[PDB]
Design a protein around this ligand. Structure first.
Ligand SMILES: Nc1nc2c(ncn2[C@@H]2O[C@H](COP(=O)(O)OP(=O)(O)OP(=O)(O)O)[C@@H](O)[C@H]2O)c(=O)[nH]1
Ligand SMILES: Nc1nc2c(ncn2[C@@H]2O[C@H](COP(=O)(O)OP(=O)(O)OP(=O)(O)O)[C@@H](O)[C@H]2O)c(=O)[nH]1
Ligand SMILES: Nc1nc2c(ncn2[C@@H]2O[C@H](COP(=O)(O)OP(=O)(O)O)[C@@H](O)[C@H]2O)c(=O)[nH]1
Ligand SMILES: Nc1nc2c(ncn2[C@@H]2O[C@H](COP(=O)(O)OP(=O)(O)O)[C@@H](O)[C@H]2O)c(=O)[nH]1
Ligand SMILES: C/C(Nc1ccccc1)=C1/C(=O)N[C@@H](Cc2ccccc2)C1=O
Ligand SMILES: C/C(Nc1ccccc1)=C1/C(=O)N[C@@H](Cc2ccccc2)C1=O
Ligand SMILES: [Mg+2]
Ligand SMILES: [Mg+2]
Lengths: 429, 420, 123, 428, 427
């Protein structure tokens, strides 16, 4: 039924602002909150917004960061009118690029408040589904508050599932060396409190724009427009009411065969720059390491569940024979023990792009959600940095500093080692 | 004498909807009111499928169960909408999950008792309730899980009376959920011990009837329900029409089932979509026209009933009927003697001058079970998507406990290719 | 064959007669069974009241599943309610005396600085 | 003296209704009961106007008994004499005897005792019932066990409807027949089997009827039965009373089953051809076609033979006609009983049902033979039974309602042994 | 979020002065009043370095400590004189001595509590105080001694917030006092346990940049302060300017420091000179990068050769294409790939702010954790124990109330810090 977004952390927040924005274009809401369509009192898009008061259309979201700065630039540029001054929690002092600070030291204090301001939004909902947690993998509040949130959300909310969108961190447009530590830290405390988790590899997004958009050295608000589009094609199912993927379970009951293995690989279809493609051709893109969403290589790992999420003008009569010659040309690549997939999700709502943005209006777009075993490639490409540093206690002392334990590091690498193991342990028979 | 109908699940319900409006046409009932039609028969056996209420009026004996609003307000908003009595609608609100357990265990038993409550007050009103029939999917929870629950709870209360279902065995091609094999094997088990007849309906068939046999590219859940709707009218007719049978539903079962397990009639139909007698008969006896995905070749017919429809000479009928049993003499069992009886009722359906329906207890149905159990153990393998039930409160071995019940049912059907 | 008949009766509306042709040439119900009709009922009543004690069976196993789940669920909440605030009050005690451990070295380059002026004012 | 009809089961009831109808035409009773010793043998002179049949009608659904309290004749019986019972027997003996039976039997049994009580010296009963099929096999069986107890000497004549694939519906048929026929046979005296197939046969050849109805078949059986019972309704020498019925036909306790053959079945539309000769109709009785149970008595031995004549006939004719039944056709007698032919003349011309299928005939004949070839149908049944039980086939529905795996065993056993007596009567 | 500034000592103060007036220009502040400039950015992050008072006005968050009037009335009488709030001036009256003890023990602690009194004010006024920074000499008491004290007392009060100093390592060549080695070692010890980052600035360098790389004959304390003033603007910028970082000062340290000792960024600069010498615009990016990565342009007197970079930041200034920047940046890491450590992965991040400094179209600042810093420490300790030998000038501290072994106690703390840097040429 209902559906709450949490965005913690500078990265979370700005991905958020850049897709609440794109939600807003899609459903036709003028910034001030009011939409001139016959679809409010308080079905269909009520999944995400709440028809509060007699005029406006507030997002069911809560925004948290530990500096102001970022949350501040929401109560600034129009959209300022869109939320409730309540729903944006800021916290005075930074997390400083450090998990321990985020979880234990600076966290402690703000968590009680957030947790409860969330409970306000769950209370204006008759049968709430779950949460969408947007947050940065590496980096301070994003790894460390997010981790604490989930532990707590997990307690305060029963079944109510939790979907995370993590931002897997990339040397080129980062600033923080200590990154890896933070990701392998959170990811450990975090994973037994999560249900399905879309990783988004900054590098791969930086990649798409440098190749497919002709952008020289792309901005954050460059990257975010792109992610904004992808997320909104994932969440698309539950917003217009979809012919498939129409609830959080039978959306993901689809994707995750095993409790641990959350991490699906996304692939967005026609990224093409303003200043059109065939139903066949865009499908035949989803399987192209370039157009990928996490830098890896799925042609060599096995697929173990595959979704195709179509959006736009499409008759299934096309989709089919297109797939047909995905199998008689390219690399099939299936696991020992699960059918040969392809849940196929048609949504007739044509894809809208941000007005003076980078991309153009497309007729049809595709979205492929694959749970391949090759996405653990980035599980090590991380690990290895973490390994090669901790090996020297490298930056450790900043953690033990704020209050942490030499061994809680040990213990988290332990988890990845073991995970990296399950992902390997799913190949053949 | 009198039958109630339970119609549970998105697949179960949108079947139930089409069924009802097609039979409601044959009798001729206004989207609300009563009779409008030059025929006069109809109403003899309307007693059976319609409990009648005040004013003119006729209202079905139907209960509609779902575990979410969505598909219920589809019926009420669609074709023969406001025909069903307002509070015969059992709402869901919650999840369904496309998961057996939620529907048989948690969110199901959550409701259930409210369903029993409508059924108990239609059947207790009903003057000589002969039995219930049910419609529903087999891969996917609200139908397969709740309904298999329903029926277990429907017996016990009503041992007594005979149970009956059109169930839709799911295929790998043309489906939504990775898991359905799990969902199916769990209800198959349930059915095989609690129903008295069970019309098997493959969507591998239903869809195949459309693209090999109909030149229809993009098969909806529409023109595909259309078949089931028709085939269901077929099977009912002679409890609901002539007076040339008389079809106790019990009698009907006793004479159709040799062995108490194995009540798995694969059906089939005559003409198709939106007819001579010979070319009607060697058509309801072709596989390329069966409702299960089998092939009534590898597998011999235990018992076989057909019912014919059209003001035509049945002096032709038994003569063609005979002919099939000799042109295909091998493929009926010998040890039950007059094991293929047919009868004829002369009031045709929507469209179509002449038509036929084939009810069929063929051990070739083993061919369907085996197909599911094949992709089931292929998944219960390294115990895959199972963790969605692990956590729901189901047992590790409870799957294996019903995987086995099925591999019996396989090699009993195999054990009945026997001897004179 | 041409035979002779034996006349066997004549009345109002008829006549009977044998016609022998070629001579022949020579060569406990019990009532007690009404207790049989309630032995038949002996086994019916056994059957139906068995697919009841086999059905009121598959019943309070349902009781299990339905709750032997919920019972195994909050068995996680009150596993992760202290895997928290006692992993986390381990933190509070942890740091707070790495503050002290920071400070008490101060009182010691401090109550050292004190004593070597009381030593200057004696040199 | 007196004479009570019981008709159990859909088949029973409709044969009944179609021969109480034909009794009525014969004795000239307008439906309402009023007609403007002798025939008091069947009806009772109740009240001052009407002429109620001495019958009782039982079925386990309403449906069929319901038809009676509907179409004129509605006026003919007493609301009491038609017992209906709510739920069906469902094509199954166990249900008929043990489960659904139990409940109604006490009532019927006593409603019969009402009719025997308005009778000074009752003779016996005529039980009409379906061989295969549910209440017909099952209730009939339970009735007889009980009628056997409640009524001393008082004999019992059954008319069974031996079941035939073409116009049946039920597969389980054989079991039910071999079931009843077992419990039933030591409580019965003489029993006319009627092979549905043979009757369906007569109509298809002799009446030109394409695919004949039930009420087609019943008009025919109605004629035959009414030629058998004839003896005791007008009172004409030979079979004046039910004891004579066995005395003439059954040499051995078990062997009840005589074979009937009705004479001139000819269809109106032919109603004015120069009608058949006393000779020719006799010479029909001995024609496997005109038979009453599908077999072949040319190859089994006869062991008692009756000829029941009805109509305009002087005995002088009958004789020389028989004479050349010998010197032409197949004699075929047993080792040790005269050479039969107890011959029954009844001057009452045979009446047919008005807008019926057959025509008014001058003379008709009826031949009641006790041949050992009629055990051909005792096996043609048996074999189906055998070839099913062999696999427990449908058994479970029985063990279900309450029965015994072994009570089946034990009934085939009886047939096996009967089939044996019937063979054991040939030559020496 | 907000930073205060303590500026103590003749060398610390006249650095402080030049700092202030150079950053005060970038933002554009009247010798007293407020803003005058067509730019509009400036003021975003003026919050940080300037606590603002009534009227228009903007006043620095500054404290000036000295142990004698002399150099305080130099500022107030000189360039941006009456800019600092009148009683943020902490006078001295007494001796300074050019002696560590007087400053850290006797005449220092004599004052100290009055300094703590201004600092406690500003910082207690300051709405989210992030940390302090300090400027001062290392050979010579009032700066090196008082400040090392200040910091020790600054902490304890402020554990909590992050500390930070530009300190001026003294050379044997171009200095006043025979003893400075003594003074240095004593503070070095102090620093290495109490600061969080500490920009090393050799006057061996500073003077060497002037005659090696300028042809500048008679090097003042003037043109030479000039460098430090510039380099200090360099380093500060991105806590005080764009919005393309965001530079927590903490974050800033966490990402810059591996091992909690060793926070010894030797720095460096892009361009140079002041008077009768130019640049023909030619500051190019390539020729800017292989310039802030040349030793002959480091602020410590090391040579970031023998010794490998732990972590390295740079910040670039000028409306230029950074699409060039990362490409040159890369290039240096490969043209000189050897001399970075492998075991911290992405250990050289750089960013760019586009509002240039006084003069100069294009310029670069190098912040720089090189273990070649070991090169500097070793240089002092070499003339220290060469003096603590037959315990020479020591008697100036003997008598002040300092201990015989207290010199050796901090001579050692230094020789650890030598061979820890040596112990980080690892694997
Ligand atoms: N894709 C993407 N990544 C971002 C964005 N902004 C920051 N990041 C990344 O965020 C990661 C670190 O998390 P941050 O949100 O920046 O840090 P935080 O501690 O959670 O938030 P603050 O410390 O208060 O700013 C790094 O990998 C950055 O590259 C953004 O707008 N888009
Ligand atoms: N001759 C004749 N045979 C019939 C008639 N009706 C049914 N039968 C036969 O009887 C057998 C089944 O017997 P039923 O009398 O229908 O069974 P029942 O239990 O007595 O009747 P129900 O109450 O309907 O179950 C089959 O062989 C039918 O062909 C009939 O009207 N006339
Ligand atoms: N033909 C028929 N089958 C359907 C329909 N909808 C779903 N199914 C099939 O039934 C199975 C699952 O049924 P579903 O309705 O999704 O489950 P439920 O709502 O929980 O009962 C799938 O394999 C589908 O292929 C439909 O309405 N008509
Ligand atoms: N560049 C910079 N260094 C200086 C300056 N003045 C002195 N120095 C060097 O730094 C040392 C310490 O400064 P000094 O004023 O003597 O220390 P004080 O006792 O705090 O006043 C001196 O001995 C010089 O070697 C200054 O003008 N700027
Ligand atoms: C055996 C049989 N019909 C039949 C009976 C005798 C001869 C020919 C056909 C039927 C039938 O017509 N309908 C099903 C009974 C049924 C089952 C479910 C819903 C409606 C009706 C059956 O078993
Ligand atoms: C980490 C860092 N800069 C930096 C930050 C992100 C990306 C690149 C360089 C700096 C810097 O520019 N200056 C010092 C901070 C500083 C130093 C002295 C006084 C005040 C503030 C630092 O840590
Ligand atoms: Mg942070
Ligand atoms: Mg569904």
């Amino acid at each position: 039924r209902e559906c709450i977004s949490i965005h913690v952390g500078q990265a979370g927040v700005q991905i958020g602002n850049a897709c609440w924005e794109l939600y807003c274009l899609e459903h036709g809401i003028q910034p001030d909150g009011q939409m001139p369509s016959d679809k409010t009192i308080g079905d269909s898009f009520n999944t995400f917004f709440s028809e509060t008061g007699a005029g406006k259309h507030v997002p069911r979201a809560v925004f948290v960061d530990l500096e102001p700065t970022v949350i501040d630039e929401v109560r600034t540029g129009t959209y300022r009118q869109l939320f409730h001054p309540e729903q944006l929690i800021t916290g005075k002092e930074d997390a400083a690029n450090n998990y321990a600070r985020g979880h234990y030291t600076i966290g402690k204090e703000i968590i009680d408040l957030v947790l409860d301001r969330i409970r306000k939004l769950a209370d204006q909902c008759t049968g709430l589904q779950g949460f969408l947690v947007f947050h940065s993998f590496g980096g301070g509040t994003g790894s460390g508050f997010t981790s604490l949130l989930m532990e707590r959300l997990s307690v305060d909310y029963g079944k109510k599932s939790k979907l995370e969108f993590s931002i897997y961190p990339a040397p080129q447009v980062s600033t923080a060396v200590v990154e890896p530590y933070n990701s392998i830290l959170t990811t450990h405390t975090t994973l037994e409190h999560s249900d399905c988790a879309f990783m988004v590899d900054n590098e791969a997004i930086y990649d798409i724009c440098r190749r497919n958009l002709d952008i020289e050295r792309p901005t954050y608000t460059n990257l975010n427009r792109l992610i904004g589009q992808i997320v909104s094609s994932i969440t698309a199912s539950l917003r217009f009411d979809g012919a498939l993927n129409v609830d959080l379970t039978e959306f993901q009951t689809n994707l995750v065969p095993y409790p641990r293995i959350h991490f699906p690989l996304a692939t967005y279809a026609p990224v093409i720059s303003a200043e059109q493609l065939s139903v066949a051709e865009i499908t035949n893109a989803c399987f192209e390491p370039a157009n990928q969403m996490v830098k890896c290589d799925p042609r060599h790992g096995k697929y173990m569940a595959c979704c195709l999420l179509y959006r736009g003008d499409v008759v299934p009569k096309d989709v089919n024979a297109a797939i047909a010659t995905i199998k008689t040309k390219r690399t099939i690549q299936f696991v020992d023990w699960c059918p040969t997939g392809f849940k196929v999700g048609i949504n007739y709502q044509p894809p809208t792009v941000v007005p003076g943005g980078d991309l153009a209006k497309v007729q049809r777009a595709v979205c492929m959600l694959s749970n391949t075993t090759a996405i653990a490639e980035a599980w090590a490409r991380l690990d290895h940095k973490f390994d090669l540093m901790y090996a020297k206690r490298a930056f450790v002392h900043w953690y033990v500093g704020e209050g942490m334990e030499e061994g809680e590091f040990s213990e988290a690498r332990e988890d990845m080692a073991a995970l990296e193991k399950d992902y390997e342990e799913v190949g053949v028979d | 004498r009198e039958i109630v109908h339970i119609q549970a699940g998105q697949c179960g319900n949108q079947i139930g909807a089409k069924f009802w409006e097609v039979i409601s046409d044959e009798h001729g009932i206004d989207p609300t009111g009563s009779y409008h039609g030059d025929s006069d028969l109809q109403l003899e056996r309307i007693n059976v499928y319609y409990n009648e209420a005040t004013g003119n009026k006729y209202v079905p004996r139907a209960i509609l169960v779902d575990l979410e609003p969505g598909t219920m307000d589809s019926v009420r908003s669609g074709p023969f909408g406001q025909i069903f009595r307002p509070d015969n609608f059992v709402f869901g609100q919650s999840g369904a999950g496309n998961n057996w357990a939620k529907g048989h265990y948690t969110e199901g038993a959550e409701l259930v008792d409210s369903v029993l409550d409508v059924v108990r007050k239609e059947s207790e009103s009903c003057d000589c309730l002969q039995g219930f029939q049910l419609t529903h999917s087999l891969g996917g929870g609200t139908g397969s899980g709740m309904g298999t629950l329903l029926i277990s709870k429907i017996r016990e209360e009503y041992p007594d009376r005979i149970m009956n279902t059109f169930s839709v065995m799911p295929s790998p091609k043309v489906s939504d959920t990775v898991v359905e094999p799990y969902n199916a094997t769990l209800s198959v088990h349930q059915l095989v011990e609690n129903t008295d007849e069970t019309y098997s309906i493959d969507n591998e068939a239903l869809y195949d009837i459309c693209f090999r046999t109909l030149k229809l590219t993009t098969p909806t859940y529409g023109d595909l329900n259309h078949l089931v709707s028709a085939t269901m009218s077929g099977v009912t007719t002679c409890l609901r029409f002539p007076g040339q049978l008389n079809a106790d539903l019990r009698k009907l079962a006793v004479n159709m089932v040799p062995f108490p397990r194995l009540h798995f009639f694969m059906p089939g139909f005559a003409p198709l979509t939106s007819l001579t007698v010979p070319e009607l008969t060697q058509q309801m006896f072709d596989s390329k026209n069966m409702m299960a995905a089998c092939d009534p070749r590898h597998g011999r017919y235990l018992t076989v009933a057909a019912v014919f429809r059209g003001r035509m000479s049945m002096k032709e009928v038994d003569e063609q009927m005979l002919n099939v049993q000799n042109k295909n003499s091998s493929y009926f069992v010998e040890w039950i003697p007059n094991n293929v009886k047919t009868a004829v009722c002369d009031i045709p359906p929507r469209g179509l001058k002449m038509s036929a329906t084939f009810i069929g207890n063929s051990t070739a149905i083993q061919e369907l079970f085996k197909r599911i159990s094949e992709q089931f153990t292929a998944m219960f393998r390294r115990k895959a998507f199972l963790h969605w039930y692990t956590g729901e409160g189901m047992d590790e071995m409870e799957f294996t406990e019903a995987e086995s019940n099925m591999n019996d049912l396989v090699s009993e059907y195999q054990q009945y290719q026997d001897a004179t | 064959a041409d035979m002779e008949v034996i006349e066997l009766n004549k009345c109002t509306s008829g006549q009977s007669f044998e016609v022998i042709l070629k001579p022949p040439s020579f060569d406990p119900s019990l009532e007690e069974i009404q207790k049989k009709l309630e032995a038949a009922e002996e086994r019916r009543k056994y059957q139906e009241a068995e697919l009841l004690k086999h059905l009121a069976e598959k019943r309070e196993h349902e009781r299990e599943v339905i709750q032997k789940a919920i019972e195994e669920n909050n068995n996680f909440i009150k596993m992760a309610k202290e895997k928290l605030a006692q992993k986390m009050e381990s933190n509070k005690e942890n740091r707070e005396a790495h503050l002290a451990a920071m400070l008490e070295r101060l009182q010691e380059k401090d109550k050292h600085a004190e004593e070597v002026r009381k030593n200057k004012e004696l040199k």
